[PDB]
A paper describes a structure:
This proteobacterial zeta toxin phosphorylates UDP-activated sugar species at the C4′-OH group of the hexose moiety which eventually causes a lytic phenotype. The toxic activity is inhibited by co-expression of ngε_1 antitoxin, corroborating that the ngε_1 / ngζ_1 locus encodes for a toxin/antitoxin pair.
Since we found UNAM to be a superb substrate in vitro compared to all other candidates which we identified by small metabolite extracts, we soaked UNAM into crystals and determined the structure of the complex. Indeed we observed a strong electron density for a UNAM molecule positioned in the active site of all four ngζ_1 polypeptide chains. To our surprise, Asp56, which most likely deprotonates the substrate before nucleophilic attack on the γ-phosphate group, is in hydrogen bonding distance to the C4′-OH group of the hexose moiety of UNAM, substantiating phosphorylation of this particular group. As expected from our initial, qualitative in vitro characterization, these measurements confirmed the apparent KM for UNAM to be more than 10-fold smaller than for UNAG or UDP-glucose.
Residue numbers in the entry:
A (entry chain A): 8 to 60
B (entry chain B): 2 to 395
The structure:
């Protein structure tokens, strides 16, 4: 089997850990859909502000 | 660095705000491509730009900053984000990296945990690129897979799957917390047409593309064989899934399980009345008595089984075949006892037989204005509802 298929299978285990381990699920789901970080957002404001019309 | 393709405009019509947000988005993506891609790679949570996704690109647009605006502006910026992701895909492929031989596509309905599954993947030395996106309409993915094969890269497609209802619950939470949900129209479209797109890919590329699945209803079960992936994903037609989702978001709003804003984003641009009208009640009847009403369905063996019982006082005995109900014509007034209602329809026994009303009428909710057992007149004057009670004692 390829590395990719193994990587997917190992990801499926950690998906199963998310169901039991609640401390693990909150560590995963915190970042995902939050939005840009303060460092990235600072850079972005300079990018957006420098190109208004 | 130029964009890989032109950005398709949508017609927003009279909404000038979205029409301007779209133009601001296209201008930004087109003119500031170099610096957008640099920030995507060097500074976002994207494995240095190897995790490629249109949703993550939305975060680099100014209109997408506040959580309040995200559901509104989403469809105005998406195509710019998608073409940016397509451009980024190509730039990662241009990097001469002989060690890195694997490209992974992750696909599935919104809310199925595609992105959370990608977070749980540990990057490897051979992993070149990881693309999250829809493959239900696979025309665009053909070009991506084509240029992977041109460079002797090993393509793997992971189809993450989940029931529409459980997936819809996950989008509600994500919307409430981060302002980012998913419409029912696109959830039904992806889930219904994904088997076709994967077979379309399988027939065009064959063994050159490995196609696997993740069933999130069976504790994230890995599915190796393509025939098993198609059986997992075959969860109904677009009409069925959209219909079930339409009734679900409406029931959840009527019960107070979701807000009006979480309802409107889920609804998206759907006319729910139009969806509800398509629902069929053939092989179905309501039995009434002094204790209440009982919905029953008939299977092929000619046997009625109880689906739902609702206790109601003050009703006579009766059997009403819901499939034989006359659709209520607009303009006229229908007077009679409500014998049954659900998220889609309201059934009224008039003097000219059983009549069916849509539970919504021009964005106005009929079902909440009447109760089962209640005697009422329902009529629409100038596309505006008039429901009067006819209850009396004499
Ligand atoms: C179906 C759809 O429009 N959007 C959905 C799809 O995005 P995606 O797959 O990234 O987007 P694409 O429009 O299907 O496009 C896929 C590819 O098509 C080319 N293209 C895209 C647009 C365009 O104008 N011109 C053009 O050439 C380009 O190569 C791109 O990579 O898949 C995502 C799954 O993670 C969903 O979240 C997303 O829906 C969420 C809720 C939403 O819609 O906001």
């Amino acid at each position: 089997e390829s590395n990719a298929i193994r990587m997917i299978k190992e990801a499926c285990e950690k998906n199963r850990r998310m169901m039991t381990d609640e401390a693990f699920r909150k560590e995963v789901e915190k970042r995902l859909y939050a939005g840009p970080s303060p460092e990235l957002l600072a850079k972005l404001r300079v990018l957006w502000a420098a190109n208004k019309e | 660095v130029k964009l890989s393709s032109d950005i398709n405009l949508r017609d927003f019509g009279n909404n000038e705000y979205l029409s301007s947000v779209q133009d601001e988005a296209i201008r930004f993506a087109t003119e500031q491509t170099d610096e957008i891609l640099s920030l995507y790679s060097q500074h976002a949570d994207t494995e240095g730009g190897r995790y490629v996704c249109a949703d993550t690109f939305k975060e680099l647009f100014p209109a997408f900053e506040n959580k309040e605006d995200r559901a509104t502006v989403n469809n105005a910026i998406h195509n710019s984000a998608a073409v940016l992701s397509s451009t980024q895909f190509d730039e990662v492929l241009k990097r001469d990296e002989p060690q890195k031989k694997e490209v992974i596509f992750v696909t599935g309905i919104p809310g199925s945990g595609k992105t959370s599954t990608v977070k749980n993947m540990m990057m490897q030395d051979t992993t070149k690129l990881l693309f999250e996106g829809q493959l239900a309409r696979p025309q665009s993915a053909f070009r991506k897979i084509e240029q992977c094969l041109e460079r002797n890269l090993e393509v793997t497609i992971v189809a993450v799957s989940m029931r529409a209802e459980r997936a819809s619950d996950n989008t509600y939470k994500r919307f409430n917390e981060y302002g980012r949900g998913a419409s029912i129209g696109i959830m039904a479209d992806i889930q219904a047409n994904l088997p076709d797109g994967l077979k379309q890919i399988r027939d065009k590329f064959g063994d050159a593309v490995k196609i696997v699945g993740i069933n999130q209803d069976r504790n994230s079960e890995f599915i190796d064989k393509f025939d098993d992936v198609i059986k997992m994903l075959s969860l109904g037609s677009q009409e069925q899934i959209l219909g079930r989702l339409a009734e679900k978001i409406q029931s959840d709003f009527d019960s107070g399980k979701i807000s009006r804003e979480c309802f409107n984003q889920a609804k998206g641009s759907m006319d729910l009345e139009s969806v509800f009208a398509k629902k069929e009640y053939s092989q179905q009847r309501v039995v009434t008595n002094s204790k209440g009403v009982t919905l029953e369905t008939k299977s092929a063996n000619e046997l009625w089984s109880k689906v739902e019982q609702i206790p109601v006082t003050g009703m006579k005995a009766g059997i009403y075949l819901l499939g034989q109900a006359k659709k209520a014509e607009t303009g006229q007034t229908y007077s009679g006892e409500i014998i049954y209602k659900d998220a889609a329809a309201v059934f009224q026994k008039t003097k000219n037989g059983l009549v069916r009303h849509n539970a919504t009428h021009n964005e106005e909710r009929l079902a909440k204005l009447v109760e089962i057992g209640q005697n009422v007149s329902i009529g629409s004057n100038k596309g505006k509802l008039i429901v009067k009670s006819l209850e009396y004692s004499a």
